[PDB]
Design an enzyme around this catalytic site. Sequence first.
Site, PDB file in Angstrom:
ATOM      1  N   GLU A 139     -73.558  47.881 -13.581  1.00  0.00           N
ATOM      2  CA  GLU A 139     -73.314  48.481 -14.889  1.00  0.00           C
ATOM      3  C   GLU A 139     -73.013  47.414 -15.917  1.00  0.00           C
ATOM      4  O   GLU A 139     -73.453  47.511 -17.067  1.00  0.00           O
ATOM      5  CB  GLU A 139     -72.168  49.480 -14.814  1.00  0.00           C
ATOM      6  CG  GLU A 139     -72.437  50.632 -13.893  1.00  0.00           C
ATOM      7  CD  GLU A 139     -71.272  51.597 -13.846  1.00  0.00           C
ATOM      8  OE1 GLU A 139     -71.194  52.469 -14.735  1.00  0.00           O
ATOM      9  OE2 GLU A 139     -70.428  51.480 -12.929  1.00  0.00           O
ATOM     10  N   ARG A 149     -69.418  59.677  -6.311  1.00  0.00           N
ATOM     11  CA  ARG A 149     -68.710  60.929  -6.082  1.00  0.00           C
ATOM     12  C   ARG A 149     -68.030  61.035  -4.726  1.00  0.00           C
ATOM     13  O   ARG A 149     -67.334  62.028  -4.504  1.00  0.00           O
ATOM     14  CB  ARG A 149     -69.659  62.114  -6.236  1.00  0.00           C
ATOM     15  CG  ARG A 149     -69.945  62.456  -7.688  1.00  0.00           C
ATOM     16  CD  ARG A 149     -70.946  63.590  -7.738  1.00  0.00           C
ATOM     17  NE  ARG A 149     -72.318  63.102  -7.565  1.00  0.00           N
ATOM     18  CZ  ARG A 149     -73.347  63.896  -7.296  1.00  0.00           C
ATOM     19  NH1 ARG A 149     -73.148  65.199  -7.151  1.00  0.00           N
ATOM     20  NH2 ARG A 149     -74.578  63.395  -7.172  1.00  0.00           N
ATOM     21  N   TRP A 200     -63.874  53.100 -11.618  1.00  0.00           N
ATOM     22  CA  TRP A 200     -64.042  51.662 -11.548  1.00  0.00           C
ATOM     23  C   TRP A 200     -65.539  51.377 -11.567  1.00  0.00           C
ATOM     24  O   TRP A 200     -66.360  52.263 -11.321  1.00  0.00           O
ATOM     25  CB  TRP A 200     -63.378  51.061 -10.308  1.00  0.00           C
ATOM     26  CG  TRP A 200     -63.795  51.704  -9.014  1.00  0.00           C
ATOM     27  CD1 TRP A 200     -64.973  51.492  -8.323  1.00  0.00           C
ATOM     28  CD2 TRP A 200     -63.046  52.652  -8.246  1.00  0.00           C
ATOM     29  NE1 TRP A 200     -64.986  52.256  -7.177  1.00  0.00           N
ATOM     30  CE2 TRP A 200     -63.819  52.975  -7.107  1.00  0.00           C
ATOM     31  CE3 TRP A 200     -61.789  53.252  -8.401  1.00  0.00           C
ATOM     32  CZ2 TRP A 200     -63.379  53.876  -6.137  1.00  0.00           C
ATOM     33  CZ3 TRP A 200     -61.349  54.154  -7.426  1.00  0.00           C
ATOM     34  CH2 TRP A 200     -62.139  54.448  -6.308  1.00  0.00           C
TER      35      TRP A 200
HETATM   36  C1  HEM Z   1     -64.604  55.909  -9.114  1.00  0.00           C
HETATM   37  C2  HEM Z   1     -65.658  55.098  -9.280  1.00  0.00           C
HETATM   38  C3  HEM Z   1     -66.953  55.545  -9.997  1.00  0.00           C
HETATM   39  C4  HEM Z   1     -68.101  54.888  -9.885  1.00  0.00           C
HETATM   40  C5  HEM Z   1     -68.369  53.619  -9.040  1.00  0.00           C
HETATM   41  C6  HEM Z   1     -69.085  55.573 -10.672  1.00  0.00           C
HETATM   42  C7  HEM Z   1     -70.397  55.180 -10.807  1.00  0.00           C
HETATM   43  C8  HEM Z   1     -71.238  55.717 -11.737  1.00  0.00           C
HETATM   44  C9  HEM Z   1     -72.446  55.102 -12.253  1.00  0.00           C
HETATM   45  C10 HEM Z   1     -72.961  53.713 -11.824  1.00  0.00           C
HETATM   46  C11 HEM Z   1     -72.999  55.957 -13.121  1.00  0.00           C
HETATM   47  C12 HEM Z   1     -74.273  55.711 -13.950  1.00  0.00           C
HETATM   48  C13 HEM Z   1     -73.690  55.390 -15.336  1.00  0.00           C
HETATM   49  C14 HEM Z   1     -74.686  54.822 -16.310  1.00  0.00           C
HETATM   50  O1  HEM Z   1     -75.792  54.436 -15.880  1.00  0.00           O
HETATM   51  O2  HEM Z   1     -74.359  54.747 -17.524  1.00  0.00           O
HETATM   52  C15 HEM Z   1     -72.145  57.139 -13.205  1.00  0.00           C
HETATM   53  C16 HEM Z   1     -72.350  58.269 -13.976  1.00  0.00           C
HETATM   54  C17 HEM Z   1     -71.469  59.326 -14.167  1.00  0.00           C
HETATM   55  N1  HEM Z   1     -70.184  59.428 -13.656  1.00  0.00           N
HETATM   56 FE1  HEM Z   1     -69.483  58.258 -12.202  1.00  0.00          FE
HETATM   57  N2  HEM Z   1     -68.499  56.664 -11.276  1.00  0.00           N
HETATM   58  C18 HEM Z   1     -67.164  56.671 -10.897  1.00  0.00           C
HETATM   59  C19 HEM Z   1     -66.229  57.599 -11.301  1.00  0.00           C
HETATM   60  C20 HEM Z   1     -66.422  58.745 -12.039  1.00  0.00           C
HETATM   61  C21 HEM Z   1     -65.392  59.701 -12.447  1.00  0.00           C
HETATM   62  C22 HEM Z   1     -63.875  59.547 -12.122  1.00  0.00           C
HETATM   63  C23 HEM Z   1     -65.996  60.680 -13.145  1.00  0.00           C
HETATM   64  C24 HEM Z   1     -65.409  61.961 -13.799  1.00  0.00           C
HETATM   65  C25 HEM Z   1     -64.202  62.469 -13.480  1.00  0.00           C
HETATM   66  C26 HEM Z   1     -67.409  60.376 -13.185  1.00  0.00           C
HETATM   67  C27 HEM Z   1     -68.381  61.123 -13.808  1.00  0.00           C
HETATM   68  C28 HEM Z   1     -69.643  60.636 -14.088  1.00  0.00           C
HETATM   69  C29 HEM Z   1     -70.626  61.305 -14.899  1.00  0.00           C
HETATM   70  C30 HEM Z   1     -70.434  62.676 -15.593  1.00  0.00           C
HETATM   71  C31 HEM Z   1     -71.713  60.532 -14.947  1.00  0.00           C
HETATM   72  C32 HEM Z   1     -73.000  60.883 -15.724  1.00  0.00           C
HETATM   73  C33 HEM Z   1     -72.919  60.139 -17.054  1.00  0.00           C
HETATM   74  C34 HEM Z   1     -74.046  60.538 -17.976  1.00  0.00           C
HETATM   75  O3  HEM Z   1     -74.763  61.540 -17.684  1.00  0.00           O
HETATM   76  O4  HEM Z   1     -74.211  59.838 -19.013  1.00  0.00           O
HETATM   77  N3  HEM Z   1     -67.624  59.188 -12.525  1.00  0.00           N
HETATM   78  N4  HEM Z   1     -71.088  56.950 -12.329  1.00  0.00           N
HETATM   79  C1  LIG Z   2     -66.048  57.000 -14.934  1.00  0.00           C
HETATM   80  C2  LIG Z   2     -67.156  55.977 -14.820  1.00  0.00           C
HETATM   81  C3  LIG Z   2     -67.148  54.980 -13.844  1.00  0.00           C
HETATM   82  C4  LIG Z   2     -68.204  54.067 -13.808  1.00  0.00           C
HETATM   83  N1  LIG Z   2     -68.279  53.065 -12.902  1.00  0.00           N
HETATM   84  N2  LIG Z   2     -69.199  54.156 -14.712  1.00  0.00           N
HETATM   85  C5  LIG Z   2     -69.231  55.110 -15.654  1.00  0.00           C
HETATM   86  C6  LIG Z   2     -70.392  55.159 -16.615  1.00  0.00           C
HETATM   87  C7  LIG Z   2     -70.239  54.198 -17.789  1.00  0.00           C
HETATM   88  C8  LIG Z   2     -71.394  54.368 -18.768  1.00  0.00           C
HETATM   89  C9  LIG Z   2     -71.955  53.214 -19.320  1.00  0.00           C
HETATM   90  C10 LIG Z   2     -73.016  53.292 -20.226  1.00  0.00           C
HETATM   91  F1  LIG Z   2     -73.557  52.180 -20.763  1.00  0.00           F
HETATM   92  C11 LIG Z   2     -73.529  54.534 -20.576  1.00  0.00           C
HETATM   93  C12 LIG Z   2     -72.978  55.691 -20.033  1.00  0.00           C
HETATM   94  C13 LIG Z   2     -73.549  57.030 -20.437  1.00  0.00           C
HETATM   95  C14 LIG Z   2     -73.349  57.186 -21.939  1.00  0.00           C
HETATM   96  C15 LIG Z   2     -71.892  57.554 -22.174  1.00  0.00           C
HETATM   97  N3  LIG Z   2     -71.202  56.723 -23.173  1.00  0.00           N
HETATM   98  C16 LIG Z   2     -69.820  57.164 -23.082  1.00  0.00           C
HETATM   99  C17 LIG Z   2     -71.182  55.287 -22.857  1.00  0.00           C
HETATM  100  C18 LIG Z   2     -71.923  55.618 -19.133  1.00  0.00           C
HETATM  101  F2  LIG Z   2     -71.453  56.791 -18.663  1.00  0.00           F
HETATM  102  C19 LIG Z   2     -68.205  56.044 -15.729  1.00  0.00           C
END
Ligand code: HEM
Ligand SMILES: Cc1cc(N)nc(CCc2cc(F)cc(CCCN(C)C)c2F)c1
Lengths: 413, 408
Positions: free
Chosen positions: B284, B110, B279
């Site tokens: 991941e 973030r 990105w």
């Molecule tokens: C720009 C580089 C970004 C990086 C490096 C990043 C990194 C991550 C990572 C490592 C996770 C954990 C995901 C998982 O374990 O599946 C995550 C979750 C999340 N990201 Fe980010 N993210 C990025 C951009 C964004 C953007 C642009 C948004 C929305 C506009 C966003 C919204 C979220 C949300 C909502 C989650 C929670 C997903 C869930 O609850 O399943 N991210 N992010």
């Molecule tokens: C914008 C963004 C950047 C980033 N670097 N990473 C993510 C998360 C990717 C992701 C991978 C994953 F295996 C499971 C979930 C939660 C379940 C949602 N489903 C849509 C996959 C994920 F958000 C999102």
Amino acid sequence: CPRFLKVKNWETEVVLTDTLHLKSTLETGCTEYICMGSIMHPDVATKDQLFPLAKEFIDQYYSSIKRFGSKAHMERLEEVNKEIDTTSTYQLKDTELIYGAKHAWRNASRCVGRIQWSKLQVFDARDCTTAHGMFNYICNHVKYATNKGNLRSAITIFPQRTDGKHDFRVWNSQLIRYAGYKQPDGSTLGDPANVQFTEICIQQGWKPPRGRFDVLPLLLQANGNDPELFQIPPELVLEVPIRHPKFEWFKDLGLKWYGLPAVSNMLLEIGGLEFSACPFSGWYMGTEIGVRDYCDNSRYNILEEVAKKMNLDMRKTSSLWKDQALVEINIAVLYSFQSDKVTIVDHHSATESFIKHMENEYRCRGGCPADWVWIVPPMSGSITPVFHQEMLNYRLTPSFEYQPDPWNTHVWK
Amino acid sequence: RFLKVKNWETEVVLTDTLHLKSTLETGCTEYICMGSIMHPATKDQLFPLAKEFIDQYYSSIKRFGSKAHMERLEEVNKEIDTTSTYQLKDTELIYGAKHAWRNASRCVGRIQWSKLQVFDARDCTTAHGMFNYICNHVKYATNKGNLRSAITIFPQRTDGKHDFRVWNSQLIRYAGYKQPDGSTLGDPANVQFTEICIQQGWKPPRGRFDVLPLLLQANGNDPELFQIPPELVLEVPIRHPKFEWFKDLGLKWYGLPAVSNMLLEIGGLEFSACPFSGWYMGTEIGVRDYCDNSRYNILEEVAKKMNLDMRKTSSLWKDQALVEINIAVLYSFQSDKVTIVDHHSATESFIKHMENEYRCRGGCPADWVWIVPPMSGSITPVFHQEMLNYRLTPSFEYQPDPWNTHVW
Ligand code: HEM
Ligand SMILES: Cc1cc(N)nc(CCc2cc(F)cc(CCCN(C)C)c2F)c1
Ligand code: HEM
Ligand SMILES: Cc1cc(N)nc(CCc2cc(F)cc(CCCN(C)C)c2F)c1
Ligand SMILES: C[C@H](O)[C@H](O)[C@H]1CNc2nc(N)[nH]c(=O)c2N1
Ligand SMILES: C[C@H](O)[C@H](O)[C@H]1CNc2nc(N)[nH]c(=O)c2N1
Ligand SMILES: [Zn+2]
């Protein structure tokens, strides 16, 4: 509160049902609006406070021995009630003490080792009156638990709190730990975690060898008196020199660690009674030494030197040199303990056993309180089964609790 | 009350006041913490939610209580009256989307929250239009490897029978195939979705890295299939800087992570189709995507080629292979100049982000269970950082999979 709560394992799709949370006692720290699950820590009981706490525990004990509602149960309730009435406290039977101690471990949500909870040797030290007697009990504990490297879990329970001015306390945070010495130039020799306690020992009269792995003395307080220093006999302190199966140079780092992890600063709460000195010990999970003790920046912090001797490129974090070195250190720790036949468990085996334990507790007890933040190991989390396991955290009693450090509260005589 | 969080490595203490602004629920109670649980309108419900949001928007541009602010509240009031909903201004849409990201407790990335390109797609009416908007998103965000964060926002929910939905979980993902002999080819996370695409007429190549088609639903209608043009799908062959045999594993991955199945809530309005992308953090791909037992599950093959002793877990052969796979992923993206961040840099940045938010905003909701990386946890600084998790709005929320609700 809902009667059934479900937890899911996202790797295996297994769904478990928790009803045991309905017996939850104290507070988690969380609310409807905020979760404090990553917060590390989120004057005695009156007669009226003690009656219901004792009854709850006595009821639980008699239910566990399949005598709930029996003549012996009703008589025990009345005897405890009279005792609280006439003395403002009560004494546990030996059977109740053992049951309570085992269940405090069984209920310890942060412990991944609880598959072993029913095989706990309980040492009753409630007849102890002096710091010399505490030392004797602790020595016997250490010798029994070490068992020449075939380690056995154990707890020694000293007299319960009375008015709060006569507490028994082990001032050590663990029975066996290495000293740390702050240097005039800001560096630290030994274990930086123990600098404060080390300084206290030195002020109390300890002559420090000022080495890298000096076993600290015991600092023991009986019946509220000033604490007294004792040297654990070195032949009772089992240690393991750390070597590596492939890297011949690893032994040249001069690392070693002690075999017995023995927490000595927690409080054991049974039936409203408070046992402020209750040192308990198990055996190590390798990551406790190889990740935390050795590689925490604020601990021994050896990642640098290991990476150098591995000839890794340490200029970019994205080479994962820290990660690569961390694994080799943890390989060395496990190899050295296994070679010396000193009980240790790797994080894969321990977490797999814990999942089986949790499932058994859900099926036979209705749940298993667990603190994910603490249960998941500090390396390789997601390739262990606990990472994908949803958990419920709640506080059941009997329980182990944190308590203030005794030098912050003690009234010096 | 004010709440304090401590970093146990640096001893830095921060003070949280922002949590006093939350009113959604966490799932925990005073007696049970659900911190590791993955998933714990009407005119009447809508105006207070709208009011709160308009209030915080006009407070954010430092015109709280202005004439423009008063007028917007009344404008919104009449509109909820005469239509049972309202439409966000463009400025409000952008503000709301950036803040849904800023408020996402589970996102370690973030620090970038205010650099988000917002694509307004609320005039879309058909799946072909969604495809066009999504192609433009993918092309803009990919940017020939210099990835740029973006979100595309399709029309909001009306009566719930006319939802816009991206059926894919991510815009770009690989298919998974249930083999005759019981095992799985490709990505096992997507077997069900892959089968739905086949059942809708998609001709599967039955490879290991077949990019899935887009399955797009507009205005509650049946979803329709589209192939993303391949020149838009940037991919990275995975090789290792030292193990020349690693490329012979035949592994690849896509550069653009783009979540497409979540719901964006702004001022009580619900945007059920809102694909967003950033990105990757290396773990991941290299820890979860490649090494989960329920995913590609390649630890055995890699450890084989490393000639590791695999008979006892305590040799840590899984841990060694895990590190080498994640080295390869980072090296491969960097060598192809595709944006990627390692978990050391990412968590460093997050700690700096938290410090910024505590200073200028009074706190930062953060979910330790999701923020700590899935490998080498305690040698990253977030492991030692106490975090407070609470729900602020605008927010991203989970929603049911559309194939469980849709009537054909
Ligand atoms: C720009 C580089 C970004 C990086 C490096 C990043 C990194 C991550 C990572 C490592 C996770 C954990 C995901 C998982 O374990 O599946 C995550 C979750 C999340 N990201 Fe980010 N993210 C990025 C951009 C964004 C953007 C642009 C948004 C929305 C506009 C966003 C919204 C979220 C949300 C909502 C989650 C929670 C997903 C869930 O609850 O399943 N991210 N992010
Ligand atoms: C914008 C963004 C950047 C980033 N670097 N990473 C993510 C998360 C990717 C992701 C991978 C994953 F295996 C499971 C979930 C939660 C379940 C949602 N489903 C849509 C996959 C994920 F958000 C999102
Ligand atoms: C027998 C093998 C055991 C193993 C492998 C084991 C493993 C662990 C580990 C890895 C932790 C986290 C340690 C840390 O990060 O500081 C822990 C915590 C804990 N263990 Fe166990 N343990 C064992 C025995 C015991 C016993 C015998 C007791 C008590 C009777 C116990 C009670 C606890 C408690 C209370 C905690 C929480 C400590 C805290 O919150 O500060 N454990 N255990
Ligand atoms: C019985 C036991 C077995 C085991 N395998 N491991 C442990 C953990 C040892 C430990 C080390 C440590 F640094 C901190 C704490 C927390 C409690 C002690 N006080 C600091 C509160 C610990 F329990 C204990
Ligand atoms: C901030 C966080 O709560 C703290 O670092 C915790 C995280 N998880 C842990 N888990 C274990 N097993 N031991 C610990 O000391 C910690 N520390
Ligand atoms: C059960 C547990 O909540 C689940 O495995 C969570 C744990 N932490 C996670 N953390 C991240 N970043 N991503 C995840 O998918 C998960 N899964
Ligand atoms: Zn909680």
